[PDB]
Amino acid sequence: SSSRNGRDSAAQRLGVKRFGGQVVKAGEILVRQRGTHFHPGVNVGRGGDDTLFALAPGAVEFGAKRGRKTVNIVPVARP
Template structure:
């Protein structure tokens, strides 16, 4: 005889909620001071001018301006905000 029921298993119901990571404001868009530009895990994108990184690697704007994404020859991505 079977020791377990042959009905659907209740052990499969675990899944984590999505973390909503990624780019929130794209290049050319206007950013207000303190607005989130990118939510990320680790430093996939690096801060440059008028931008700061929070302790969870989220990149925020420091000033009111236009967002600029720039890649170097070593495939690093830098984000800055240009005042308008």
């Protein structure tokens, strides 16, 4: 007379965190993710948990490189 279900796992707060256009510093986290849904491009690095981060400051551009959505960083214009 039991429901043997009921369990669940607390969240991990995944997804995009710095969308198109924004200004990001270095080492900042663009997206947390399990697999490489989004891949790195230029001035972008990968983590251990397939997190992404910035290697050079600038601003974002979610473009594709041969069918795969990438993330990039572009040079800000110095004031």
